[PDB]
Amino acid sequence: MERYENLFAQLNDRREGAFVPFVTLGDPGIEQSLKIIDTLIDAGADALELGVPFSDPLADGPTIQNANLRAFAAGVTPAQCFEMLALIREKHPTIPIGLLMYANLVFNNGIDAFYARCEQVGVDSVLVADVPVEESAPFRQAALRHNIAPIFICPPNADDDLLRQVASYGRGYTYLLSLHHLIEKLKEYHAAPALQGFGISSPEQVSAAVRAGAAGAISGSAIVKIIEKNLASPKQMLAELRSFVSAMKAASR
Amino acid sequence: MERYENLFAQLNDRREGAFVPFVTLGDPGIEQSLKIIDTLIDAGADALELGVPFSDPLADGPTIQNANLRAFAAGVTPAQCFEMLALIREKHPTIPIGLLMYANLVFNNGIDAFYARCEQVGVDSVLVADVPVEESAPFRQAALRHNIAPIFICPPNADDDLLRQVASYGRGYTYLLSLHHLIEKLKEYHAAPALQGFGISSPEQVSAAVRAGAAGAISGSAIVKIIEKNLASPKQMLAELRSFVSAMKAASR
Amino acid sequence: TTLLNPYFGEFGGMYVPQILMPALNQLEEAFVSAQKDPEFQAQFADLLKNYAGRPTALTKCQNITAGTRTTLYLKREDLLHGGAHKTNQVLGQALLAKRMGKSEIIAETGAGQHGVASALASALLGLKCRIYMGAKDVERQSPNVFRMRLMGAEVIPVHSGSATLKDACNEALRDWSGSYETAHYMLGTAAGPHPYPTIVREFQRMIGEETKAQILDKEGRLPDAVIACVGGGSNAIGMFADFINDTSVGLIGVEPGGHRVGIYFGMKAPMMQTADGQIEESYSISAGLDFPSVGPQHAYLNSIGRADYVSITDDEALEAFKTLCRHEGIIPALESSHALAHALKMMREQPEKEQLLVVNLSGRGDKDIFTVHDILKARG
Amino acid sequence: TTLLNPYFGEFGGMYVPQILMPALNQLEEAFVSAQKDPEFQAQFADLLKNYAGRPTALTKCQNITAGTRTTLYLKREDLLHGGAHKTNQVLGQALLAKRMGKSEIIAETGAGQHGVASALASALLGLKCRIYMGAKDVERQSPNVFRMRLMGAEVIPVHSGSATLKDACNEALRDWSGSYETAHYMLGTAAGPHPYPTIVREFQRMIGEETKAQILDKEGRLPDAVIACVGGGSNAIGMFADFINDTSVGLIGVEPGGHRVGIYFGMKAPMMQTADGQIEESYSISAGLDFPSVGPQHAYLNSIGRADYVSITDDEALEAFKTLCRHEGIIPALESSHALAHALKMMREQPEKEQLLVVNLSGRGDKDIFTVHDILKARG
C-alpha cells in the first residue's frame, strides 16, 4: 500500500492541500466514534489521524485529555481500538489512516507485533510521540518491515541536523508542529510532505499552511471540542462536524 | 513567750507525750476551719500545726493537696490566714502554734517582715519545708529576732553532721520525719524535743512514738481525711474529729 | 548525539518528545562541564557542609545486635537539613540550574517530600519554584503544602485526570517544554530520561563515599554488605556507587512488598503495569516508596548480578520502625524502616554469622507518626 | 557543704527539703568526678559525634542581610538528633546517671520537647524512663506523648491540681525523694537547685565552643554579638559560656514578650509571681519559652552588666519565622525565632552599622507548623 503517495499526487493534480482531522478512538463511545469518523470522511476529510487511549499522555493538553477519559470510561480497550481500525478500513479503502501513539503501548506485546497488527487492520502510519529520532531505530525498522510509515515530529526548535534526520527517516508525511523556512529546508532534503499540526482551528489557518508550502493541516482540538460541547445532541454534533470539516476542507484550495 | 518549753515541762510532769494535729487553714472554709480547730483543741490537742495555702507545695502528697485546693477555692488569702491565727491565739493563750510554710511566701514581703507578722499574731514556730539547714541562716536569724522558734526536719536518711546541726539550730521542737537511735542521738546533743510526723494515723502509733523516746506525734493526713470524707455533714465531721483526737491523745500516756 | 551513554546495558535512554531533546542535551552538557569545574565543586561542597550539615554520622547499634555476631551501623541521612537524603541532590541540581542561567525551578511531588526539598533549595539559591501536585495528594498532605508555601514556592494543585502524581508529573513536562530556556525541571529520583539517572547518582554519591571512609576508620575493613531501600532508587545508588568496584561488598536494594520491562517516565525500565500495558500504581505503607518503576542503573546492576533486590512488607517495616525507636531512640522514616527490617532478618535468621552491615537510614520518621498511630489504633 | 559554690552572686542555692540534700550532694560529687575523667570525656564525645551529629553547621545568611552592613550566621542546633539543643545535655546527664549506677531516669515536661529528649537518651543508654506530664498538657500534645512511648518511656499523666507542669514537676520530686538511689532526676534547663544550673551549662557549652572556632575560621575575628533565646536559659548559657571572658563580645538573651526575686523551683531567682507571692504562668506563642523564672547564672550576668536581656513579641517572632523560611529555606522553632527577630531588628534599625552577629538557632520549627497555620487562618 502507498496511500499517502497517492493522496498527495492526487491533491497536487488538483492544486489542493490535505485537510486531516484528528479524534480519539472510542470517544465518546465505540459506536458514536464510528459515526463521528464516518461523518468526518463524508464531509471531505482527506486522511485521518487517530489516537489510542493511554494511561499517561505526556504530549497532550485538555480537550484531549478529556477525550481519553471519556474513552477509558466507556470501557475501550486497545483490542476494540483495532477492530474499529479494521472496519474503518473495510469501509474506506483509499483514505490514509494514521495513528498517534505513545511508546509503552507499542512496546508492550512486542514492537514487531504492534506493527504487524496495524498492517493487518490496514493502518498506514504511526507516530510515536515520546520517541525522539535519536532513539527511533527499532520502531522505524519494525514499521517499515510491515509496510507502515514511521512518522516524525519536526519541532519549531529544529536545527539542521534534525531536519536532515527527519527527512531521511520519515515516510508518508512529516508532522510540522506549530515556518516557511522550515518548510523549504524539508523540501530541499526531499522529506515526506509536511502536514502542519497544533492549533489549527479556523479556515484561514489551513490556507495559510498551504500557501506557505505545507502539503496540508491536521486539526484535533477543534474537532474534539465540537464533540465535548455536544455530548447530548448527537444529531447536532454530527451536523456541526460536517459544517466544520466542509469549510476547513474548502480552505485547502 | 516560751510556749513549747512550758507544754513539754508540763506533759513530762504528767509522764505524757504531746498529740499535735495538723490542718490547712481555711479548709474547707474560713469559718468552718475555725470551728474544726477549736474542736481539735477541745478534744485534747496539745499544740497545733497549721499550713498556709501555697501555689506549689512540693513537700506534699494528696489528701493534703486537696485541702489546699479547697482552700484557694473558698478564696483564702495569706492575709485572712493571719487574722485567723490572731483569733486562734486570742481564744487559746497557752497552746503552742506552729506553721508549716514554703519558702516563697516567707521571702515575698521580706523575711524579716513575715516573722514580724507571726510574732504579732502570736505564732510560736515556723518550719520552712524547702529550706535545708545548710541554707537556713537568714530564716533562723529572722525567726529568733522575733521570738519565733525555727523548726527543722530531721530525716530518716540523716547522718551525724546533720543531727548535730539540727540540734544546734532548731528551737521549740524537732520535726522527726517517718527511729529509736535517731531519737537518742538527738537527745545526746540536747536538740529540741522530737515530735514524730508523717504517717501517724492510729493510737498505737502515738504510743509507739512516746515509748521510743519522742516527746510526741504530729497527725495531719488522718485529720484532713476526716474533713474530706465529711464535707456535707459538718456535725458528724466535728463529732468524728472529737472522737479521733480524744483517742489519739489518750494513747499518749 | 550525547556526550555520555544514555543507557545502562539495555535500560535507560531518553524517551521524551523531540521538542525536549535540546533541554536534555543542554543539561547533560552543563553537568559534564560542572563535574570538571573546581569552582562548581567548591560551591556544592560549601552548601553541603555549611548548609545541609554534611558529613553525616555513621552510628553503631549494639543495643540491637546484642547476642548475635552482626555489627550494624546506620548512615545518618535522617540528620541532614530537611530530614532526608533528597536535600543532597536538589542542592546540586539547583546550582546547575544557576550555571545554565536559569531563574526558575519546576518540580512534581506525590506526598510532598520532594516538593519540600525542591522548595528549600530554590529559596536558598534565589530561584522561583513552581511545584506540581495531584489534587488528591494535595488534600491529604496539608502540612507539606504549607511548608512549601512558607518557603516561597507556588504549589499548583492539579485537577485533571486521576488528579494524582501521574497527572502532576505530566503537567510539569508540558510546562518545561515551553520554558526550558529559563526554568530547570528538578527530578526527584535516579530515574527518568538521561541525563537524570546519572546526575542524581553523582549528586547522592557522597553518601557511600563518606560511609566507606567512616567504616575504614572505625572497623579497619569494608562492610560485608550495604543495604538501602528503593523507590526510584536515589538513596540506594548514592550509598552503592562507591562500593560497586569493591567486589566483596554485598549491595542489597529493598523494595516495598506492601500487604516487566516497558518504556515510561522517559526511560526503558522494569515497570508495574497491566496486561494491556497501562502503568499501575504501587502500594506501600510508606508513600515514599510508591514508584511504579525503578532507575535503569538498578535494573542493570540486578541483570548482571552485582546487586540483589529483595522485598519487605508493611508489617515487617513497622516492626523495624518500633525496634529502632525503642532500642536506639531514633525515629526512622518508614521508607528506610524497610531497609533496616531486612538487615534485622539477616541478623535474626542467622544469629551466629559474623557480618558487618550498613544500613542507609535515608530519613527520620517524625512525618510518619500519624500513619503509624492510625495503624496501631485500627488493629487494637 | 558542697564542693562548688551553689550561688551565682546572690542567685541560685539549693532550696529543697532536707531529704533531697544527699541526692544533690551525690550528683555534684559525681559531676565533679566525671569532669576530670578522660574516659567520661571520651564517652560523652563519642555520643555527641557519632550519635547526635556534632559538630553542628554555622550557616551564613546573605539573602537576609543583603543591602545592610550586618553579616549574620546561625549556629545550627536544629540539625542535632532530635531537632533541638536539649539532646546535648540529656546525653551528658544520662551518662552521669550511669556513673552513679542508676538504672532509672525521671523527668517532667510541658509541651513534650524535654520529655522526647529524655526518652531518646534513656533508650540509648539502656535506662528505664518515667516522664511526668500535666494531664492538660497530655491531651494537647498527642504526637509528643506517642513519640515518648515509641521510645519505651512511661508517660504518667498527672491528674491532680491544675494538672499542668506545676503539678507534674512536683510529682517528679516526690518520686525522686524515695528513689534517688536508683533513679536520676533529669532536669530540662539551666535552672533549679545546685548543681543543675552548673551541670546544664557545662553539658551545652560545646555550642559556644564550636561557634568560637567556626567563626575564627570563617571570618578571622570574634562576633560583635551572640544572640540566643531564653526560657530557663540552657541554649543561651551554652552559646554564651565560652565567650564570657571575651569582653568585646556582646551576649544578648531574648525572652518572650507574648501579646521580681523569689525562691522557687529550688533556687533564688527573678520570678513571675503575684502580689501575694504565688508563682504565675508565663505566656508565649511558643510553649517552650513559658518559664516563670530564669536560671541564676543569667540573673547574675544581667546584675553585673555582662549580658543584656531583651524581649520580642509573638508577632515579631512569627515575622522572623516567615523570613527565615522564605529567604533561607530553614524552618526555625518558634522559640529560636524570638532570637532571630532580635538580630533582624538590630540589622534593620541600623542598616549601615557594621556588625558580625551569631544567632543560636536552638531548634527546627516542623513542630510549630500547626500553630503557625492556625494563627495565619484566625487572622485571614
Ligand SMILES: CC(C)[C@H](NC(=O)Cc1c[nH]c2ccccc12)C(=O)O
Ligand atoms: C490533537 C492534535 C494532534 C494536536 N495536538 C498537538 O499537535 C500536539 C500533540 C500532543 N501530543 C501529541 C502526540 C502526537 C502528535 C502531536 C501531539 C492538536 O489539535 O492540538
Ligand SMILES: CC(C)[C@H](NC(=O)Cc1c[nH]c2ccccc12)C(=O)O
Ligand atoms: C501533713 C503532715 C505535716 C504530714 N505530712 C508529712 O509529714 C510530710 C510533709 C509534706 N510536706 C511537709 C512540710 C512540712 C513538714 C512535713 C511535710 C502528714 O500527716 O502526712
Ligand SMILES: *Cc1c(COP(=O)(O)O)cnc(C)c1O
Ligand atoms: C524519597 C525518599 C525515599 C525514596 O526515594 P529514592 O529515590 O529511592 O531514594 C526513601 N527514603 C526517604 C526517607 C525518602 O525521603
Ligand SMILES: *Cc1c(COP(=O)(O)O)cnc(C)c1O
Ligand atoms: C527547650 C527549648 C528552648 C528553651 O529552653 P532553654 O533552656 O532556654 O534553652 C528554646 N528553644 C528550643 C528549640 C527548645 O527546644
